[model samples]
Target chain A: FNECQLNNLNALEPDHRVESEGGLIETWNSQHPELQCAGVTVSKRTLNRNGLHLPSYSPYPQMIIVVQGKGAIGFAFPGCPETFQDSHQKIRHFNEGDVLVIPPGVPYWTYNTGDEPVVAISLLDTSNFNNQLDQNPRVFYLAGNPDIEHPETMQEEGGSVLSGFSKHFLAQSFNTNEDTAEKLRSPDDERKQIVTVEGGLSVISNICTMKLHENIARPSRADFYNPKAGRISTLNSLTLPALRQFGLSAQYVVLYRNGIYSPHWNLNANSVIYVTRGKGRVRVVNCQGNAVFDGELRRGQLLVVPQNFVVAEQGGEQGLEYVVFKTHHNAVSSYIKDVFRAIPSEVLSNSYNLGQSQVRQLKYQGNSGPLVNP
Target chain B: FNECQLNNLNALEPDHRVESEGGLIETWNSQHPELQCAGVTVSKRTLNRNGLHLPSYSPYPQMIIVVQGKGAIGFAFPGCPETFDSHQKIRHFNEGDVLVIPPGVPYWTYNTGDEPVVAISLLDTSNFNNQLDQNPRVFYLAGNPDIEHPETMQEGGSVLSGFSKHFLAQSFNTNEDTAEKLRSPDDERKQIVTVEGGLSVIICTMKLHENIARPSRADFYNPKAGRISTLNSLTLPALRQFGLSAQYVVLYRNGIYSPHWNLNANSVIYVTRGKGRVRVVNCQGNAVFDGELRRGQLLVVPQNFVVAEQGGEQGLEYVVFKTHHNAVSSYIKDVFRAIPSEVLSNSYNLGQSQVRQLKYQGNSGPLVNP
Candidate 1:
């Protein structure tokens, strides 16, 4: 159950009632309980041009990849207490192959401004929040006026700030009169949840695509590269502050054709991976170092690697490209190098009864990225 | 058992062989299997100025605190492949109040204070070994010089020493003779066991408390409740070479830390004084456990669980060891604060009034007394 096919899953039909005209969402968690142990949920989303997903916040973090089309996403950093108009809001344009991460409780929204529909896949880590497959993540939307939604305020005291305080308190805090405060509380925009904007908004100019890319630090280095070995690039909250609240990270890997990504284990996270464009063989070893999964994976396949389970992947003839959604924003890895470097060489040599020369060779032989040639 | 009496544990007997003279070592893992599940081990060690724990490395990480006296510790960053004389070593001294860490990095400790140095350490992750192997082999690189050892017998003794003399010499543009000296056995000192020395080395002069760049001081403080001192690669530049961090907190009576979740790392907390109650809630908002924590108690809070602490009448104090070098806490109260008040009001079907009230109702800083 560590692996599953994503292409065969059901997609939202045209008649489905969605905010966006061509928007569609297909989730696979119902059929993949194995992902539960890893605290991950998988879903695919498609949005037509001019389509928008209203502003919202989730209780869990998500690692998202743009598989097709283009869109723009914006978010406000957590603990900032800033309004959408606060100018400090972070915005970025994403194209096909681009990746973005959103932390839990961070307010954000996405809109497709390109010609084609935006297609993206998201891996949400619920380990920090909701772990039950039967229960969906609680997404609090912030587009419409709360007063209108809950007209009978006294009858239904919702989870809104207004419910927690009186109108007079809101007026004083906002530094405005009750009438102005009421107007501030409820804007007059009549657009539906996801509406096509005529010229997009002016705030879109604040997109920090370049700045965002600058902050996306790559964990893998070229010095660790080898022809037979693969390459990996990772982005985390430590490198990108925007991902801090979500408690998740993103890893992009490219394996050499017929080469193997060395056996390694994550010290801090579970990995929810998607085979974006590849054919590969993956092997997951349990804590006992027993093989739990040793099989082939094709394009659109999803796999889960629980924390501390050693996993290795070998690419097919054409090679492989995949994205991994790490449950921890700054996931630490313990590879063969870490093991070799931790214990004394004498211990390894004497324990295994290997010659000193052989031990030296073994110690310095491994690749750095957990990427290795067979 | 989460709580135990540390004072009653058997100390290193005088007749029993130990590295540190008059120093004692006590461990409680045998009676506490719960710690094993959390991948943690706890122990206490005491050493005098003449005591020196020889150079060694472990597969797991360790977060150590100076409970009494003073000492100096240093580590060689892994993957640097440099010898001790290369000037790449990171060293710092510790008083009774400081915390230090070494993450699978080769390190050694020396007592420098006039009083015997007593330390409490929490080891993260157990030593990797085959389950069938009965003899738990903790690897070491040093031993008594007179002892017949395969590593010491050879000119280019240990693997690292062998590599340094051969491969490293060529790589670093250093002479093989110099590299050989790096591996040369210390004729006067033992490799792993402690050795008595006259006055600690001047190299141990680096003060732990005064060196702002080496060890971070207590930064998170709240006048109402308590203060939290955190040390990590970010706050302490010297610690950047290692992979561990620590946090120490003191809570006043009736103070509550509020509901918060560590987004980045697991926390192993050791209660040092007083008493407190800890409550943790899972993803579904159900309490996983609600129990009292007393002195000598250890609590494991895995990453992602929402946890809160309330101090008892005597107040509470604890030290937390984090697996990662830097970990962040996201409080539930701050969640709304991060978003605009308008957004919260619009999203939760509440008015601006309620949002403002709720925001004001929650604690502001790291500590809170409510």
Candidate 2:
């Protein structure tokens, strides 16, 4: 769609459930083609208790957040500590609301430990520059259930990533015996994706768990604090440090009843926002000064805002909460208040050609915190 | 810019040439922000005889085509084995070869022969994997960790004994002997004996002969009109991670290629041998481009832009670097065949009977008629 048509498109529409087996896997942009214009795909996944999301990796960065229930996620970095051990690993436990950013090419898996279904919303940046290829999602599952029919996940080589390499190459790379390498590749050639643990999941014991937990917990903290309205925390290279290499970042915001966020835009990064709690009315403006989306954002609905595009949000009577994923690891929100505060009043007067007093009035005043104030 | 503005922009403007000590570097940016909006940037590089392009890395992915001469690239990624013998990397490129380099990975290019090596590069700056900051930033790894500058690139292409052979062998999972070969350009012999000028002809000829047709990954093969050999991730396993593909087209005189659009990619086309007229129509129904392209000319056809081309007297030969790794070309006839006649008629606001006579098949492989 053209920019004008995108202006008329409803970006804040509820995602259509694409699957309903263990829980639900809903895709927002795939159903709403216009959202693709912003180069972000938002998907909501729910994993029933004891359910496991199989090991997988993508060529694009994914910033995800747990919206409901608690779960444990374990992702392995290539050529890292995973070198010393096998599966049955534990990273750390995540609460109802948290940011779990997935870097490109890093293998990861999630297990639902809580009794309630675990819901996590993912915003994938398919257009990330490091993706270095196409806008199409090239998500590769390290191991897939043969019964599953997702073409993207089903690598032509084989279900396991090991199938792509030769036995000799694998043994050499893994520093293991050739026969053992053979077993690692196939593992009796059976199905094991999104399967129940059945009261089992033998992860490595203590020392390693604590080491990996440090990785998962350090960046997972929601650092923003607010007294009157609500919190608006950001997690990126500054928090995770590891995310900088992958070029990924995220934001989690909570707004109290009738709370409002001032107009702000992500500088040099595209962002995908999903409303996970309550309701909020959002106004998203594009580069041409046209509001691409101006509507209410209900739970389960998501919207993509292109880089440099302005966005303003206000909560309903019940308050609101949302999670956002941006393409740049160090992306910062450029708020109108900050812009005004940085510019001199004389320059503002000269630029706007308005009276000095009016320009002075345009200058930002005190207390410029997160835009959580009404 | 909006699609309308992009439609009005010229995609075939000539590139600005940058002269250096070794050879010439011509960049097609600055001349065309239109192409940048489509998420692509094109550049041309020429290496003097025995010259080299230094080891470097960028955050943006690059799709490069060797327009002339033979070259060798010895690139290593973490965990990938360097099974090939020292310096004699197995994967080599000659004229007509397209090479893909992932962003943030370091690679070095060498001119293996006397003929000046000329290569064309197309950058995918629009992909999410690349941080779209400025046009393009290149970081050259020069002699020492302390020495770094864009100007140092003249002597910065690469050095044989640049690093610890032991460390490299460990990184490539190869032995020290192999790493030594990778490091030493001047073993007892300065370099691998370049085949005597006269003796290299046979191998070069055979390589050219193979480049002609047996690459029958052709979506459509016709005896008279033309043929198209495609390369995607499925065809080139290494491309599985690069996220881009290419297609080579050979057309006979006066042959016309059917109208088609890259299903999910923008294609940057460069003519190699013939002359042809190309047309591009954007989704907004605007003719984004309409021009005659000769050898050495280039054009950018953005995604969702329908394109068509017709060969002139000499016919046309060209290669397209697409942004999509496994880009599917949706052709006119195939699209028509997939649709019901009633729906097609109503969609076009035509009489139902007219849709019945629309013959879309029979020798219909993107190449209609000469």
Candidate 3:
């Protein structure tokens, strides 16, 4: 249980999640001005096997990472074709380490297909140009249990948002029987936002059936790798088109023991880092060129580094691994490495007021290491 | 001091190097039938600044690593467009850790665009397809230097096998004046190739460009590769926390690691598979481990210990766990890197001839006879 602080870089802790029959979903309630300024809301969800989250539309766009388990996601966007043939489902199969991004206005829902519990973290950008109303997060379910309840959200209505609609009018609009409309708008309805089906939902799953994620099924490459250090990989608007509309990006960094990840300054992007595994020392520099936050970041902690902040990390004993989410689509990164080769030898000497000989030694010392020994 | 042997993996000792005004190039004179069967040749060339290796095309495509120095290469590929608008030089500048691969194309290299460079060659298999496996070779643009000279053409005066003047003239469809000139000869022992050829010939060159991006340049460069891969603090970033570095060396049959020592780190090596004979010496130059290591064997060498390893005929491979994430290795052959020539002569009391002999013999690379 933690509250967002403006001055301190503190790890966020969400209120207890409201579990449904199928699983549960939790979103942070932060009054922090930085989140308001960035217009991003972070949420997480878990779905048990055979469970499903209702298709919903939020004005805000969100990017998600499948943190655990495998699942089938139905992202039926406007004018989308029936790519997956099944008795009743169209799906994209996803597992851990896979990124799932859904732009706003698209009705999307996920189902746990694997035996393991499905867990995902979603970052919704409320400040997206598509949202004109309020900065708060709102989810309007298209269809689900009739009488939905979220004690944590402190809001309960006869299940579906449609439950409050005119029964006779809904019947005319759908050309369905009044009984169907009556039940659709029933106040006595009792069901969960997420519910488990009797058996597994069968959908013909094809890895190539998904859009913007064909490469995930193909061979892969790391963004950076150091034989003696570590490896880094990232997803951005440039590499993943799904992130383009929301101006979001993310990176997965794994640093072996004492391996140092490249320290860089983010020009216009804000980063929210969550360590999934291991521990490490992280230092984030602020505008005044001071370490606003330099401490150990262990497993399962969250920290938001404002835009243009210089941040770097080094692994601990067993090594550190984390997933970092950024607020900008194409976050500008100016690394510490560029300085060595970018500046001329003479210019460096003049700037430092050092002799040319010393400058020569400085140039030859080491290099722009994506990772390095101590 | 050493000649390459087929039955044994011996460090190559080339016949005395022939120096030129540009620099010098020495190729192996291996009589081994294995080389003939493989249809590959290895060469090491060094050019000084302002030195130029003349344009020549061997049917063999070769991959080359710029072992040292920075220089520019001029590749006049067939039908390549003139990309640079400068004064008579079309070049790609390259330096250390940068690889230069020529796909059996026409090319020339000039040193002194900056500094001299030392390059080693590895021929490709594409030659067998294109050259009928008759051992594709270099076709010099000037002074026809293909095939070992003094053994002209063939035993018969057959049209396909003759190098006679009549054959030369008719082949060119010209008189002796032009045909004889077509068969070029240097001006009585001239040192370099010269030409006032048309500008369009060179200005027309184009290149597809260097690509390190396609499918695993590191794959074929990996798997099935007997080459070495490093696991330094950079890749395993956490290695620094443990203050250690690891390397996986997969030696091909009869291959070996160059004599080298690591600074500030002691190595605890494990033989995962295969066998090897390793010789190790300490600070006092004592043989600490001069025996063979077989599969599952574990051995440790102290810090700054000089060691040499030679794989058994079965193909030795091992993993080295060494202390220090930023450990530095000192290769014995590259002693010229930090030591001065005066220290060598003064310390060894060797004459200048012996000094040059040592320099020539020391010419080596990352792996011995690899």
C-alpha lDDT values of all predictions:
0.55, 0.60, 0.55
Each model's fnat? 0.00, 0.00, 0.00
Docking category of candidate 1: incorrect
Q: What is the iRMSD of the candidate numbered 2?
A: 25.2
lDDT string for model 2 (B260-356, tens) is 8877787888787899888888777777678788777777777777889888877888888887778877878677778998899879987866776
lDDT of 1 by residue, A203-316 (tens): 653223323432122444332455674677767765676555556677778887666665455654667778778888776644222345667887776777755455667788
Evaluated at residue B94, the lDDT of candidate 2 is: 76
Superposed Cα deviation of residue B164, candidate 3 (Å): 79
Q: Which stretches of candidate 2 lie over 4 Å from their true place?
A: A1-6, A12-23, A29-35, A76-91, A129-133, A142-192, A202-226, A350-353, A364-366, A370-374, B1-370
The DockQ scores of all candidates, in the order shown, are 0.03, 0.01, 0.01
| Greater-lDDT candidate between 1 and 2 | 2
For model 3, state the Cα shift of residue B302 in Å. Answer: 76
Cα deviation in Å at residue B114, candidate 3?
A: 34
Tens digits of per-residue lDDT for model 1 on B1-370? 3332121112111111233233455454422433433445566666755455544444344567775567666554434442321223335566535444433244556665578776677665443211111111122333322222121112212323323244334322334654444344333333333333443224232223322222246665676687777777765554443456677777887777878888877666777777988886666666656778877666767567778888898888777777666777877777877888998988888987899877887556647787
TM-score of each: 0.48, 0.46, 0.47
Off by over 4 Å in 1: A1-21, A28-40, A48-50, A75-91, A103-107, A125-136, A142-223, A237-239, A338-344, A364-369, B1-61, B64-79, B82-370
Task: State the lDDT at A169 in candidate 1.
Answer: 85
Please name the candidate that would achieve the greatest lDDT relative to the true structure: 2
